[PDB]
Design a protein around this ligand. Sequence first.
Ligand SMILES: [Ca+2]
Ligand SMILES: [Ca+2]
Lengths: 588, 588
Amino acid sequence: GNLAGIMHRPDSEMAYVVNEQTVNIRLRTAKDDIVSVELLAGDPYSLRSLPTDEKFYQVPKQMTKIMSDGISDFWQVTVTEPKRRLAYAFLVTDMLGIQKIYSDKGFFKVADADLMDMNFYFRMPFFQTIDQYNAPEWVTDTVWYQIFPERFANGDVSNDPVGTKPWDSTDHPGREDFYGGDLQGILDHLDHLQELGISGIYLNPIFQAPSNHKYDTQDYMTVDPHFGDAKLFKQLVQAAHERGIRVMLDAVFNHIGDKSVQWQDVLKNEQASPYADWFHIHQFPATYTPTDNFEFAADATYDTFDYTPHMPKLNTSNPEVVDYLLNIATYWVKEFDIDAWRLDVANEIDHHFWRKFHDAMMALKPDFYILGEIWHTSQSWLVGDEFTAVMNYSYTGAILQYFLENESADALVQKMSHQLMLYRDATNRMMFNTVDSHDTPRLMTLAHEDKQLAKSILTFTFMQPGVPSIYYGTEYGMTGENDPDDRKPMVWQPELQDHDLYDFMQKLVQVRRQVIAKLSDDKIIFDVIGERQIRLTREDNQTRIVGVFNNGTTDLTVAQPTSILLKTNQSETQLAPNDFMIWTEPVR
Amino acid sequence: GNLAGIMHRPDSEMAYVVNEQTVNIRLRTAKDDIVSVELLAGDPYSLRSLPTDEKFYQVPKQMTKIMSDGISDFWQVTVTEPKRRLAYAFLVTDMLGIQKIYSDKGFFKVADADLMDMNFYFRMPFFQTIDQYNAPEWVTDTVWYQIFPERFANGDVSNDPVGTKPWDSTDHPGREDFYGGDLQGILDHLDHLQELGISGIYLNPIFQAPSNHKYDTQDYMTVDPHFGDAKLFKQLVQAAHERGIRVMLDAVFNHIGDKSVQWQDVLKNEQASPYADWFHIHQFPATYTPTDNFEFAADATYDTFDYTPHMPKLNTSNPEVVDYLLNIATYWVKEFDIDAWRLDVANEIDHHFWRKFHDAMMALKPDFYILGEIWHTSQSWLVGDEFTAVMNYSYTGAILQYFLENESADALVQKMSHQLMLYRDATNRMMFNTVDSHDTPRLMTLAHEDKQLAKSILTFTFMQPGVPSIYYGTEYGMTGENDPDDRKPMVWQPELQDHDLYDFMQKLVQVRRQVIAKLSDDKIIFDVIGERQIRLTREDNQTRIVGVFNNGTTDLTVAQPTSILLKTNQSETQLAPNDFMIWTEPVR
Ligand SMILES: [Ca+2]
Ligand SMILES: [Ca+2]
């Protein structure tokens, strides 16, 4: 067999605690190289301490091949052990029938393995629930809706910025435009969110800042006055909660804006500023050479987000900065009862800080949801001690690549399988899936205004393990290239709304919340059934949901389902190119 | 090539911060499958934000194959980046000349890789020294000596336990015997430790407890009165420090003894005890059925170390237990200035506790040494936020297996290489190498009283990256089977001491402290030069230390070295079976 392709990393996503007496264990092997895997496992001390002749290694446990990413196969098994201590090793057999034991000490013929020595084995030394990953149950039933507040609704002209433009959803907004959207406008349209069926709002930043996006924070402790005030924000959160809608705010903790009190003090006082060590200043005075692009300088003497001199990086290792940020994080939760924090550029802040942040948030609300913005592999933030999940851009990006280009279905399934096997099973359910956002081109533009294709992408994404989010306006087919063009004023004029797409998104949200979210500990299966034809199955012990997606250039015939939930062709058996059909069937 | 054998895990021992601007990156490949690896790396934001035509991926960095474990090859490179943000990917070429790029997104032909997208790459998002692993420099120059205090020297008969036996190093001690060793006896023989050349003492537990080993703690805040008192312990630490000898105590935090106040309160008050939740009690009253072995019960209604009813497991998730243990840990450091804690059964206590323990100790002493007792892979405790090192029993165990049995030299080198590549380079230097201890048979007994073999094992171990420790009496050739027979009274009678071995150990300690410890950032090379013949090389930029070990059954001829440091044959060119020769040569 392919020994170099076999790996088990103890105390990781391959060996983790699910509850006080139960663990999940995974093994990686080379794809289709290993025919079977059994786990030998039990209490390490039992081997030599118990007087019985029975030994734990005499009764193997079968592992199941759960996924493949085209390179490796991934095997898993759940183990219960009342003594809450586990030693384990793997019996692996290849295609030619060659069997070896694989353990912490390496590979062995069975006859050569020192199975009576607890130290031969990999170890889960004591099952520690304090160290485990916990998924908040409420997220399961959530469909999110993301609001960029400057652009959702102007509920109050009296707080509008100077130079506010007329509300026109057909505009191509510039980087520094204002349209007057505010918190009163969100409050005014909660009925729309409830009618669409969403149950969580993700707001882009709302704290005082000079820009239309407010990632260049001036004051984290104040609602931007062009958006509202503390009383209005409290009213909004209470009104959302009364409708069953939770609220997630955007925490911009990697960097602060250059008009903050703290940075302005650095500019006045140089190294004598009480805030000098709140930043990463290489040379005083803190300077840069302006360029024709306000968001770029080549030579700032301080670290910044990207290369913008207006977003000096915060030194989150400084205890005073830690205290400042934790007090902000605590304030909005304690005083306004928000349900979650989305963490902007979360990967560029240290793990030490995020552990303290986690502990502080869980002390306030044990079911708090902590969502990191990270666009690459995020294993080290998703162990159970830092974030709940990340914005799952690598996953939705693979989906977009499949539907919009000509990849094989095999390639998509391989990428999604790779992603799922990076993380604990419960973590995968908490991932935040949005096909587009304020940082991407709009779905309907990527789809070249092919509504059927847009519906296929949305439906496929809504069937995935992660929780889905709808970027404002998706439900009416809003167009836009990347930022700033993805931030058009929300389309409230019915003549400009795609009503068929809105009806469809209502139905899709209902399939997600009433069917997909109510399966019990389901298994997901990706089957490639033909060229660019995928059958997605989610199933529990009584009910199976199946989605067939035909994204080739030919028609596809399927058996007539008894219980169709959602489809795009008028036929109950025929799928034309880019059609899909979702149905439900009992498990037999 | 063997794609399933290639792996890079970001934010791990394969990608870690060395200093503010410098990182080490590793890649695993299948053994001898990949001919070369180049790293493509630079600031993620530079690709699209800088106006230059130059891109970081245009100038690859060569990686070096540093080790192989017989299954995989391990490649490494050091990267400096002033912007302190790194995106990277690997250019891998196999034996047939097939080249691909390997990144966070998978494997690609170069022409198909989206090299302008920062999210294509693996990421070190910002170099965080607060998250990095730090090795305390003083450990580099240390040779440790481990004292089991009941058995090292009786410096005071007046504190002896009832039934203390005459001091006789030829006895075979029973599990419950006492010989009267105490802290005054250690103080009395500091001259012996200084003459041997050791610079650190590791003490087995010294706090109040009823047994001869004192792992069944009664009171962590009191020196056991048969050993001494607080004034005497302070005198000992100051006398050790005056000689340049640091002091490491044994922290027994997984479990407490059943004669502790806390457990006795549980026995009196059942669940109404204020200490009920300091333990893991499944059923009250806390009970067990005694057996003929005092260290075993089959049915204790509470979790224990192993199956002994006398060592109830502590619930270290309980904040009151956390506070109690941290106050103990702090007390001995603050009040007595000890230099290190050795953590008994450290793997069975949760990571959350060990992070708090780490933070508390480093706040007292930034160069504190935290040594975990773990007999299996220990990656998750050695990231930089918990322990400094572990007792390196898997490494010394592989060495013993080679010298005492008939393994190939290839097998030993593979095992040591596997071990080193589990951990960060600096971590490997901090590992605590002891060939025997109070929990193993004695070296001289494992070697069947073959002194030459014992010398070979010690010398080979002392050339390894980790810091070595001498279990008391090794220097005089003490014998013993496993516990309790490995705890004989120290041999102070010259007629019973191996003086030739003592002289040799003095010389070996000097080679370690004066030569091996004074190389500058050396590279270690394991060469198998013949059947059971190994050439071990450690070298920096000016000086190379070479050890040749002949453990076959034939003679071995080597070139006459100019500068022999240590050897066992009278010849300067001939090594008989089990001879070795260490020499030094300039690097050219
Ligand atoms: Ca307004
Ligand atoms: Ca005594």
